[PDB]
């Protein structure tokens, strides 16, 4: 629930793929990034 902001320069096709993912699941772009980066740390290490 504690929030922060993030302003980065990421690739288009990749961010946009996820954008389409957010369109398909009607998800929020942010929510998807957070899920992405969340399941990424656990899939990796942290």
């Amino acid at each position: 629930k504690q929030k922060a902001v993030f302003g980065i320069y990421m690739d288009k096709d990749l961010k946009t793929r996820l954008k389409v993912y957010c369109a398909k699941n009607n998800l929020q772009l942010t929510q998807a990034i957070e899920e992405a980066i969340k399941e990424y740390l656990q899939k990796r290490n942290g």
Copy 2:
């Protein structure tokens, strides 16, 4: 290589966990997000 910008409000601990991941691997925050969101789409569907 085609770049875009992204400005969202994501959780702290989560984004910050990844920040520590970027500190540990000396990675770039953005590069980590992109890897995160990349491996997320493929782990999911797209």
